[PDB]
Design an enzyme around this catalytic site. Structure first.
Site, PDB file in Angstrom:
ATOM      1  N   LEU A 217      17.233  40.943  -2.035  1.00 46.65           N
ATOM      2  CA  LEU A 217      18.227  41.242  -3.090  1.00 46.65           C
ATOM      3  C   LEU A 217      18.791  39.750  -3.401  1.00 46.65           C
ATOM      4  O   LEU A 217      18.327  38.961  -4.290  1.00 46.65           O
ATOM      5  CB  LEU A 217      19.097  41.299  -3.113  1.00 46.65           C
ATOM      6  CG  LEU A 217      19.006  43.568  -2.692  1.00 46.65           C
ATOM      7  CD1 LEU A 217      20.514  44.807  -2.566  1.00 46.65           C
ATOM      8  CD2 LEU A 217      18.011  43.834  -3.568  1.00 46.65           C
TER       9      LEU A 217
ATOM     10  N   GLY B 225      22.609  32.821   5.733  1.00 45.42           N
ATOM     11  CA  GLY B 225      22.626  34.599   5.048  1.00 45.42           C
ATOM     12  C   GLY B 225      21.148  35.067   3.959  1.00 45.42           C
ATOM     13  O   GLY B 225      20.642  34.660   3.505  1.00 45.42           O
TER      14      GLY B 225
ATOM     15  N   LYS C 276      24.153  43.237   3.544  1.00 40.34           N
ATOM     16  CA  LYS C 276      24.278  41.646   3.990  1.00 40.34           C
ATOM     17  C   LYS C 276      24.504  41.401   5.573  1.00 40.34           C
ATOM     18  O   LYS C 276      24.747  42.165   6.430  1.00 40.34           O
ATOM     19  CB  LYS C 276      25.763  40.981   3.646  1.00 40.34           C
ATOM     20  CG  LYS C 276      26.374  39.637   3.496  1.00 40.34           C
ATOM     21  CD  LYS C 276      26.845  38.753   3.081  1.00 40.34           C
ATOM     22  CE  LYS C 276      27.253  38.394   1.507  1.00 40.34           C
ATOM     23  NZ  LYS C 276      28.945  38.386   1.784  1.00 40.34           N
TER      24      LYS C 276
ATOM     25  N   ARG D 125      27.947  35.101 -11.963  1.00 38.58           N
ATOM     26  CA  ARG D 125      26.930  35.477 -10.845  1.00 38.58           C
ATOM     27  C   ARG D 125      27.641  36.278  -9.691  1.00 38.58           C
ATOM     28  O   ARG D 125      26.294  36.846  -8.691  1.00 38.58           O
ATOM     29  CB  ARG D 125      26.359  34.152 -10.192  1.00 38.58           C
ATOM     30  CG  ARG D 125      27.205  32.957  -9.580  1.00 38.58           C
ATOM     31  CD  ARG D 125      26.650  32.117  -9.089  1.00 38.58           C
ATOM     32  NE  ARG D 125      28.266  31.144  -8.469  1.00 38.58           N
ATOM     33  CZ  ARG D 125      28.977  30.350  -9.100  1.00 38.58           C
ATOM     34  NH1 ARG D 125      28.941  30.395 -10.359  1.00 38.58           N
ATOM     35  NH2 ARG D 125      30.044  29.852  -8.693  1.00 38.58           N
ATOM     36  N   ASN D 126      28.667  36.537  -9.727  1.00 34.65           N
ATOM     37  CA  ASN D 126      29.562  36.853  -8.226  1.00 34.65           C
ATOM     38  C   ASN D 126      30.292  38.630  -9.154  1.00 34.65           C
ATOM     39  O   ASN D 126      30.578  38.704  -8.041  1.00 34.65           O
ATOM     40  CB  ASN D 126      30.107  36.208  -7.120  1.00 34.65           C
ATOM     41  CG  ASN D 126      29.869  35.524  -6.574  1.00 34.65           C
ATOM     42  OD1 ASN D 126      28.719  36.463  -5.979  1.00 34.65           O
ATOM     43  ND2 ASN D 126      30.809  34.538  -6.061  1.00 34.65           N
TER      44      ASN D 126
END
Ligand SMILES: Cc1cc(C(=O)Nc2cccc(Oc3ccc4nc(NC(=O)C5CC5)cn4n3)c2)n(C)n1
Length: 303
Positions: free
Chosen positions: A29, A35, A57, A167-168
């Site tokens: 994603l 990460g 994550k 964006r978060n």
């Protein structure tokens, strides 16, 4: 804030540990330098014997033990924060030796709010069959209200975000938005939203003057970022400070009191709320609790 000393926080494996063999990993994603977040199907993670799409994550090639420690601290702080409708909520973790550390959270169908809103410019009417899936002012104010609620919640947990921006913010089903922190799963050295300042890549366009100039991060600097997020929402995902070079002069002018003009879809009240969030004095910015009240009122006034 306690989110600076995460290492002392508990990880209760009996509650949170999820077997790796119950997690079917899918497509990424998002991927950064160290990460990534992967879509996965988790069997029975939150409801007995029920498959659930989740977001995982984990680290990737390039990461070191330092990033592993960071991801473990993220897991601990997510447990501390706990669940709220408007925050991405922890569902489980894989921490056992022999595989990667995996932090498993709710999956948000529509992904980041900036990209989503930018995709809806042709599907927006301020008020309303034809317009079935159209965004409206009600949606935009609602998203704003929800993010304020999530931030008020984070504040109640003695946490601060430090990278608040559209964006978060992730959009889920039923117009629910959730605060996330993509963190290491974003390539900040490649993302134009993160600008080199010294030997750091920082989200300058979202940062309060005291953060830029004084390295000060507080819940009130998050309120500044929230004002920028509001501008992003009411521009339908435009990039802040259009036509401005993000340099030393920008920072000086910002400190001097120069502000963005009203975006295309704002109401007058919403623009004033942006200006309020951008008060030069952190203590004179509204609190998230005050923003919750205010945005709730504006949402109602829209109806
Ligand atoms: C500290 C601290 C850290 C966090 C945090 O959020 N950690 C976190 C943990 C795991 C994944 C993650 O990222 C996510 C999560 C859900 C999601 N759903 C999508 N959907 C899509 O991409 C759709 C196809 C378009 C993308 N993600 N990425 C964020 N918090 C809140 N506080």
């Amino acid at each position: 804030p306690l989110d600076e000393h995460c290492e002392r926080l508990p990880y209760d494996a009996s509650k949170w540990e999820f077997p790796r063999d119950r997690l079917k990993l899918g497509k990424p994603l998002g991927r950064g330098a160290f990460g990534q977040v992967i879509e996965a199907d988790a069997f029975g993670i939150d409801k007995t014997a029920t498959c659930r799409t989740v977001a995982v994550k984990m680290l990737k090639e390039g990461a070191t033990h330092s990033e592993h420690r960071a991801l473990m601290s993220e897991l601990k702080i997510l447990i501390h924060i706990g669940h709220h409708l408007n925050v991405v909520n922890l569902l489980g973790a894989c921490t056992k030796p022999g595989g990667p550390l995996m932090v498993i959270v709710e999956f948000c169908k529509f992904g980041n709010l900036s990209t989503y809103l930018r995709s809806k410019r042709n599907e927006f009417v301020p008020y309303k069959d034809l317009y079935k899936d159209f965004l409206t002012l009600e949606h935009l104010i609602c998203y704003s209200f929800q993010v304020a609620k999530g931030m008020e919640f984070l504040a109640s947990r003695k946490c601060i975000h430090r990278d608040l921006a559209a964006r978060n913010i992730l959009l889920s089903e039923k117009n629910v938005v959730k605060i996330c922190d993509f963190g290491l799963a974003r390539d900040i050295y490649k993302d134009p939203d993160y600008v080199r300042k010294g030997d750091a890549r920082l989200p300058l366009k979202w940062m309060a003057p005291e953060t830029i100039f004084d390295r000060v991060y507080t819940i009130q600097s998050d309120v500044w970022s929230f004002g920028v997020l509001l501008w992003e929402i009411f521009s339908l995902g435009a990039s802040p400070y259009p036509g401005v070079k993000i340099d030393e002069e920008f920072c000086r002018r910002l400190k001097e009191g120069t502000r963005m003009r009203a975006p295309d879809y704002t109401t007058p009240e919403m623009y004033q709320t942006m200006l309020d969030c951008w008060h030069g004095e952190p203590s004179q910015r509204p609190t998230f609790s005050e923003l919750v009240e205010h945005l709730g009122n504006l949402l109602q006034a829209n109806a």
